[PDB]
């Protein structure tokens, strides 16, 4: 949010393309964005949801009859150990969803880099995440660019002529 | 607990059609994606196709050239792998595997095949062969006195001409199991398997004690027995 | 007060033994006399109130 | 700080432009960029300043009579839990105020990326925050790019014919 | 990791450039952004293992003879802010070093902007960390975008004939 719109018919994975050529169009989802993400995000599930737990003997936390000080001071602790959790509940939580939105914006700002160092002369940007290639660009085309097997000296000389002109 | 069964195989002639299946159990499949890895006698593993969840990405090696066919159902939780214009290089042991999707310990989001294939199944034998069964021709060997200072002499049986493999060779009806060396199968100008089993033995009990190689064919119910002397 | 009919109660109180202690108890009156021990183990065991059945 | 300097006598908003043509100078606060980084900010103040304090019945903290142990147990709780509550107090502030820079960087990289996305074949960068417009710009093309209602293509035709001339 | 790797023989600093023409090649680390790197780096260090420790009086955390609820009490008190301890260890070091490779992902994107505010007209990057320049570089040319002295009006008229030709 400048990315205008995502893809909802792209089911296949979390990042891709939709190419538009003389051949027809589609979406196909890329395979090298996709999972550098799932690596970064899956990390940061498996340190707080697994093997995050403690096995201790505890004290009674509910009580019916009222003793006195002994009785207040547990309770202190507790309600106290309680907010703290929930205190940093909400500063791990609420951090990893905000970390998350840049992670998201990180990983589409390594793909606009690496899309990036391959159309510097052979392409611009158009404003809503779309890049304009100014050269015939083919299925092939489009999956050098998926693979990162796109070289930039073999378009050169087709797209600056109809960049600038 | 997550385990993978394979069933679809048998003996099939070179030019048919058959359908493999992946029996999944333990965990969700429709979350997970699948493949189609073989493993073919004399070399190394081989990938096929893959496919994912939404089916709607689908791969194919350079050796498939689109004769094959890979499904999947999320109601039936199996794979169909269809199996079109084989020939006798296809002749190998078929397997499924699950991708694992990420790079930690428990995968909550399945990614792709990244890293690794951490799930592997049994297996199913599908052999290609337009040769049809045939029992085994049991062929004795006579042994002879060729260490002088050790005073041995080895024998065994020669089985030959037989379908499908294997065979189990024993001797004595597996009272003899001691130095008995069991080779395996190897192919021959007509198609057909031939292995031999041979045990060693000192020379002094050639001409007293009785070798019997016990040969027993399973689908074919063929036992020639041919005594060793 | 009157609790399951009867009007008296007996007071509870605990003695941990360590190894190589001698337990002496000397009374005159009013005394409950053990018939055993218990072994202190250690683990990650504890209790709780619960109104669940088991499954 | 690539910024050399900012602007002392824009006191109408957080960001803004500096226009300079034959038509005079001035400065106008931008609407979009200083609205959009407010939301992020008074969105940090809310959930922490506000609505979470604890109403409940406490111990008593301080004490005249030395007593022992039961004064000793509660004396080691309390002043654990204003450490953990200052410990916390340095983990909490200390890094809002460092992703606030974090948060007024990305604003400027995003205001960057609308002046960016629209100034491709018309403009360049100077290297203090500035563009170099290689074109006829009035004051209505100054609100153009303020309001993100700029065209490219109108002016495609005037700045590429002095950028690399 | 675009950088496809770095240099293990300059161990003068922790940043630098490598340049080559016709007068050799060589390395030589940067006095810019190294010192300004260090400045964050040792900064999160002295406000975490300097002057964060605690002097006071702490209570009998071990006991040899047990009582019963009196240490039933303490021992629950101990055991959380020990894990209380160890979960703002695990919360705070693992940011850290979460935070120090955007940090140096920062400082490599200050560093490609400080070379890009003097290479717009000049060079373009070539998808490994390097950047093509299209005129005549001398060493005097490298020690200038090292120390920000570089001019971009000097050099504009040598480049630009061979960038796009």
């Known amino acids: 949010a400048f990315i205008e719109n995502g893809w909802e018919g792209m089911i296949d994975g979390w990042y891709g393309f939709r190419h538009q050529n003389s051949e027809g169009t589609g979406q196909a989802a890329d395979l090298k964005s996709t999972q550098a993400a799932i690596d970064q995000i899956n990390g940061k599930l498996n340190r707080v949801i697994e093997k995050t737990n403690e096995k201790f003997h505890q004290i009674e936390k509910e009580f019916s009859e009222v003793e006195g000080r002994i009785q207040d001071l547990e309770k202190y602790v507790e309600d106290t150990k309680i907010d703290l959790w929930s205190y940093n509940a909400e500063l791990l939580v609420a951090l990893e969803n905000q970390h998350t939105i840049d992670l998201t914006d990180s990983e589409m700002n390594k793909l606009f880099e690496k899309t990036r160092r391959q159309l510097r002369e052979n392409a611009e940007d158009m404003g809503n995440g779309c890049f304009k290639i100014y050269h015939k660009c083919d299925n092939a085309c489009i999956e050098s660019i998926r693979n990162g097997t796109y070289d930039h000296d073999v378009y050169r000389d087709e797209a600056l002529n109809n960049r600038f002109q | 607990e997550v385990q993978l069964v394979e069933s679809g195989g048998g003996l099939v002639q070179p030019g048919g059609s058959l359908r493999l299946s992946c029996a999944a159990s333990?965990?969700?499949?429709?979350?997970?994606?699948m493949n189609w890895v073989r493993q073919a006698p004399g070399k190394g593993l081989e990938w096929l196709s893959y496919?994912?969840?939404?089916?709607?990405?689908?791969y194919y090696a350079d050796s498939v050239k689109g004769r094959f066919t890979i499904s999947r159902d999320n109601a039936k939780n199996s794979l169909f792998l269809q199996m079109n214009s084989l020939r006798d290089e296809d002749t190998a042991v078929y397997y499924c595997?699950?991708?694992?999707?990420?790079?930690?310990?428990?995968?909550?989001?399945?990614?792709?095949?990244?890293?690794?294939?951490?799930?592997w199944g049994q297996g199913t034998t599908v052999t290609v062969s337009s040769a049809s069964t045939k029992g085994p021709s049991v062929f004795p060997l006579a042994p002879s006195s060729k260490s002088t200072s050790g005073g041995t002499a080895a024998l065994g049986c020669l089985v030959k001409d037989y379908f499908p493999e294997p065979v189990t060779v024993s001797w004595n009806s597996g009272a003899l199991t001691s130095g008995v060396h069991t080779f395996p199968a190897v192919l021959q100008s007509s198609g057909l398997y031939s292995l031999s089993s041979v045990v060693t033995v000192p020379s002094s009990s050639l001409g007293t004690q009785t070798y019997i190689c016990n040969v027993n064919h399973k689908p074919s119910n063929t036992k020639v027995d041919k005594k060793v002397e | 007060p009157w609790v399951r009919g009867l009007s008296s109660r007996i007071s509870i109180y605990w003695t941990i033994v360590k190894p190589g202690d001698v337990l002496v108890i000397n009374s005159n009156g009013n005394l409950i006399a053990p018939r055993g021990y218990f072994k202190m183990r250690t683990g990650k065991s504890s209790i709780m109130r619960s109104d669940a059945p088991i499954d | 700080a690539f910024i050399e300097n900012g602007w002392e006598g824009m006191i109408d908003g957080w960001y803004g432009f500096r226009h300079q043509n034959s038509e005079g100078t001035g400065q106008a606060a931008d609407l979009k960029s200083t609205q959009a980084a407010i939301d992020q900010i008074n969105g940090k103040l809310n959930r922490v300043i506000e609505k979470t304090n604890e109403k409940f019945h406490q111990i008593e903290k301080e004490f005249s009579e030395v007593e022992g142990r039961i004064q000793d147990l509660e004396k080691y709780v309390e002043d654990t839990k204003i450490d953990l509550w200052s410990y916390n107090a340095e983990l909490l502030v200390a890094l809002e105020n460092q992703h606030t820079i974090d948060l007024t960087d990305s604003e400027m990289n995003k205001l960057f990326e609308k002046t960016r996305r629209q100034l491709r074949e018309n403009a360049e960068d100077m290297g203090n925050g500035c563009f170099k417009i290689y074109h006829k710009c009035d004051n209505a093309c100054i609100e153009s790019i303020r309001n993100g209602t700029y065209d490219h293509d109108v002016y495609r035709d005037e700045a590429l014919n002095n950028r690399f001339q | 990791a675009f950088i496809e790797n770095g240099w293990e023989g300059m161990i003068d600093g922790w940043y630098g450039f490598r340049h080559q023409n016709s007068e050799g090649t060589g390395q030589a680390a940067d006095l810019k952004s190294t010192q300004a790197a260090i400045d964050q780096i040792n900064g999160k260090l002295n406000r975490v293992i300097e002057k964060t420790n605690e002097k006071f009086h702490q209570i009998e955390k071990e006991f040899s003879e047990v009582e019963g609820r009196i240490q039933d009490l303490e021992k629950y008190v101990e055991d959380t802010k020990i894990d209380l301890w160890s979960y703002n260890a695990e919360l705070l070091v693992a940011l850290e070093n979460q935070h120090t490779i955007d940090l140096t992902d920062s400082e490599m994107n200050k560093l490609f902007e400080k070379t890009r505010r003097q290479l717009r007209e000049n060079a373009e990057d070539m998808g490994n960390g390097c950047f093509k320049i299209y005129h005549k570089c001398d060493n005097a040319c490298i020690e200038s975008i090292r120390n920000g002295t570089y001019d971009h009006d000097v050099y504009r008229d040598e480049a630009l004939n061979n960038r796009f030709q």
């Open positions: 595997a699950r991708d694992r999707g990420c790079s930690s310990t428990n995968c909550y989001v399945v990614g792709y095949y990244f890293y690794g294939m951490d799930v």
């Open positions: 333990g965990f969700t499949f429709s979350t997970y994606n």
């Open positions: 496919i994912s969840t939404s089916s709607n990405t689908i």
